[PDB]
Design a protein around this ligand. Sequence first.
Ligand SMILES: CC(=O)N[C@@H]1[C@@H](O)[C@H](O[C@@H]2O[C@H](CO)[C@@H](O[C@@H]3O[C@H](CO[C@H]4O[C@H](CO)[C@@H](O)[C@H](O)[C@@H]4O[C@@H]4O[C@H](CO)[C@@H](O[C@@H]5O[C@H](CO)[C@H](O)[C@H](O)[C@H]5O)[C@H](O)[C@H]4NC(C)=O)[C@@H](O)[C@H](O[C@H]4O[C@H](CO)[C@@H](O)[C@H](O)[C@@H]4O)[C@@H]3O)[C@H](O)[C@H]2NC(C)=O)[C@@H](CO[C@H]2O[C@@H](C)[C@@H](O)[C@@H](O)[C@@H]2O)O[C@@H]1O
Ligand SMILES: CC(=O)N[C@H]1[C@@H](O[C@@H]2[C@@H](OC[C@H]3O[C@H](O)[C@@H](O)[C@@H](O)[C@@H]3O)O[C@H](CO)[C@@H](O)[C@@H]2O)O[C@H](CO)[C@@H](O[C@H]2O[C@H](CO)[C@H](O)[C@H](O)[C@H]2O)[C@@H]1O
Ligand SMILES: [Ca+2]
Ligand SMILES: [Ca+2]
Lengths: 177, 208
Amino acid sequence: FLFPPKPKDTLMISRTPEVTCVEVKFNWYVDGVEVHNAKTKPREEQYVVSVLTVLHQDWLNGKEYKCKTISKAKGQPREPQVYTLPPSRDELTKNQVSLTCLVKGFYPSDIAVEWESNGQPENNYKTTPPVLDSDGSFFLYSKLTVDKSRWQQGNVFSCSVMHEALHNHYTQKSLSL
Amino acid sequence: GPSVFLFPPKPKDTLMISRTPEVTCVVVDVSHEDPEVKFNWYVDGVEVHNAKTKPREEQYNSTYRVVSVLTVLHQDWLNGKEYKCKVSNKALPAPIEKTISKAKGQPREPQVYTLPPSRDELTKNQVSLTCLVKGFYPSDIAVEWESNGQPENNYKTTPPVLDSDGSFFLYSKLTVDKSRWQQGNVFSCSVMHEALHNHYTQKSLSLS
RNA sequence: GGAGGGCCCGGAACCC
RNA sequence: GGAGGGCCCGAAAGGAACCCA
Ligand SMILES: CC(=O)N[C@@H]1[C@@H](O)[C@H](O[C@@H]2O[C@H](CO)[C@@H](O[C@@H]3O[C@H](CO[C@H]4O[C@H](CO)[C@@H](O)[C@H](O)[C@@H]4O[C@@H]4O[C@H](CO)[C@@H](O[C@@H]5O[C@H](CO)[C@H](O)[C@H](O)[C@H]5O)[C@H](O)[C@H]4NC(C)=O)[C@@H](O)[C@H](O[C@H]4O[C@H](CO)[C@@H](O)[C@H](O)[C@@H]4O)[C@@H]3O)[C@H](O)[C@H]2NC(C)=O)[C@@H](CO[C@H]2O[C@@H](C)[C@@H](O)[C@@H](O)[C@@H]2O)O[C@@H]1O
Ligand SMILES: CC(=O)N[C@H]1[C@@H](O[C@@H]2[C@@H](OC[C@H]3O[C@H](O)[C@@H](O)[C@@H](O)[C@@H]3O)O[C@H](CO)[C@@H](O)[C@@H]2O)O[C@H](CO)[C@@H](O[C@H]2O[C@H](CO)[C@H](O)[C@H](O)[C@H]2O)[C@@H]1O
Ligand SMILES: [Ca+2]
Ligand SMILES: [Ca+2]
């Protein structure tokens, strides 16, 4: 089973994207050109492993990768529309409230969404997996949970989105009372 | 030998008396040497005989897919009883056993919140109506939308997502023409879950 | 008219 | 204090977590 890299890895440089070709003999070929930079790990049993760190720009340009071939999903990429939604008035009676980020109209589904405040990553947030919309693109929601007081006292939060179809592959939207 | 898969009932089926929940045991990868398959069902150890098996199905991949459906009782499923499906085929060393049941744990009542379109989205001709459903447990749930008491079909719902507090949440998005939003239509998000009163609740949403 | 381009029949869908 | 009750402690019993006025 040949697996693709993590969207973030392919998105942010700090990380390193890699493909995985999960008496074992490996032979990798990027668009044919056999390469020798792969690396494997320990082992398992019975019937594996081995990873080829790909280059951000290569994977992005849909280069082929085999050892079973694999590459970036095909189709015209579509840029995400990012919308922030404040908590429901009904949620204002709870100790914590939900700050919502809607990300829709993107393709491929490989994306990374984060929340921050004061240039610092927020901790308590969860993002749904991408969901196929009726128009061929995907959408997801990311929920930030914060103490009710951090919201009412004016703190400003930002939803950050990274995706290949975005200018500079990144965008963000803020949210505050 | 062939493969086996046990499917739980539809969340909405276990929650409404007007519906009949059921468990499904599907067997694929069945050979022709012996396309004969036997099913044995057990409810918490005890074997039951009310299962309905459907005749084998010729699959494009030159194989057979055989299905057995077992009717379960609403309260049984919701109370945690386990359902075991034992398959038997000579083209298989030992009989395959699959067991399924509702997830263990204290059920939690989902909190339902409707969110209007973002001001920025109002520049579009199409807008999103959002329904946030959080804090529920187990993850089995059903979500629907209506407008003025009538069925709305243009919505997509995310799968449940495990939250940091041990509970699940999800979002449901209904897409409507901006004009219908601005004209005062009253939209409503309906949720069905065991931990809800009467297993049902709904929140309205309309232009203020 | 171009030049690009998986989830309704190479195309629709999807930067000038 | 009363009653229930998978995704950190505990090897596990079980508990933290999670309706009762
Ligand atoms: C080996 C080979 O080459 N032969 C082929 C067969 O393998 C192939 O059959 C498939 O085998 C796979 C095993 O390799 C199976 O993988 C497992 O898939 C399940 C998810 O299955 C869901 O969803 C599928 C699509 O999302 C759908 O196709 C399946 O039929 C099934 O749908 C659900 O069915 C149940 C049963 O009816 C529904 O139950 C509901 O129950 C309610 C109350 O009980 C109520 O009554 C409802 O009315 C009733 O429907 C349920 O609603 C359906 N849900 C959906 C999604 O619609 C997955 O969970 C498994 O995951 C686990 O196992 C894997 C290992 O693979 C692990 O990695 C995971 O971690 C999990 O542990 C498996 O992935 C696959 O399901 C089999 N598919 C079928 C059709 O049975 C056959 C059939 O191929 C189909 O597709 C094409 C090839 C086509 O050309 C046709 O052949 C055919 O349509 O083909 C060869 O024989
Ligand atoms: C989250 C996760 O578990 N995925 C990790 C792993 O996924 C395997 C996955 O295999 C998919 C299945 O596909 C067919 O439909 C099946 O019939 C099977 O053939 C096959 O299993 O799920 C199975 C369990 O069912 C299991 O083998 C794995 O969970 O795939 C990668 C490792 O095998 C792993 O990705 C890693 O490597 C990539 C590089 O490509 C990333 O850069 C990361 O380093 C890391 O995530 C993946 O996360
Ligand atoms: Ca095509
Ligand atoms: Ca435990």
